Amino acid sequence: SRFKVSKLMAYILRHSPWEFGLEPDEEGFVSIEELVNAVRKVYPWVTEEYIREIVERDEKGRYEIRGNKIRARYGHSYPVILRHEEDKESKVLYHGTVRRNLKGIMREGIKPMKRQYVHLSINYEDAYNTGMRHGEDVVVLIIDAECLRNKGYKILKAGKKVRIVKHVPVDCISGIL
Numbered sequence: 001s002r003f004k005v006s007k008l009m010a011y012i013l014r015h016s017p018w019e020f021g022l023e024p025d026e027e028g029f030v031s032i033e034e035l036v037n038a039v040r041k042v043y044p045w046v047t048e049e050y051i052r053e054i055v056e057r058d059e060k061g062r063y064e065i066r067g068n069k070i071r072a073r074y075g076h077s078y079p080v081i082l083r084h085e086e087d088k089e090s091k092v093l094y095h096g097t098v099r100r101n102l103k104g105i106m107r108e109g110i111k112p113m114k115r116q117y118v119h120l121s122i123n124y125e126d127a128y129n130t131g132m133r134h135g136e137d138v139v140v141l142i143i144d145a146e147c148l149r150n151k152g153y154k155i156l157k158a159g160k161k162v163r164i165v166k167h168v169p170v171d172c173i174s175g176i177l
Ligand SMILES: Nc1ncnc2c1ncn2[C@@H]1O[C@H](COP(=O)(O)O)[C@@H](O)[C@H]1OP(=O)(O)O
Pocket: 002, 003, 006, 007, 008, 010, 060, 062, 075, 133
């Protein structure tokens, strides 16, 4: 199914490409032809046309293809430089987290998990669902994106709803939901 093959694609492209004999470049891209060969180790019926279709139909914009290169647009656990197009229009973004993190966030802002980027969403519901990954007692921070930009932080369009930024200072957090 597209779900099973996309879940593997995301694991290879975000977390363990070397296990599959792939070497990402500095921007996270691998050969899409080599990716097909890697995925066929698990799902031998997959084709390049199928992987391209998964990319086109993905509801979050998880993937990006340029020529023969494919990458995950976000969520890597290894170093990548992601020169995505800047989100210049959003005025408010959201960050889902768990209540036990409020004390540190209100002291030093939102920090990336050594991940280079903090993840935000244009939608409250998506941020809530992301926060659920770290526990049950989820809260959603309202982020003043214009304030963020004014401080010099570039906010990048990483997915259809996901936005990435280096750091969110405390004074850019306008509310808790
Ligand atoms: N259809 C999918 N294709 C690729 N990755 C997926 C898919 N659904 C969930 N994932 C990923 O599995 C992890 C667990 O997700 P969840 O908590 O929603 O179950 C997330 O990294 C999530 O990435 P993503 O944030 O892009 O959905």
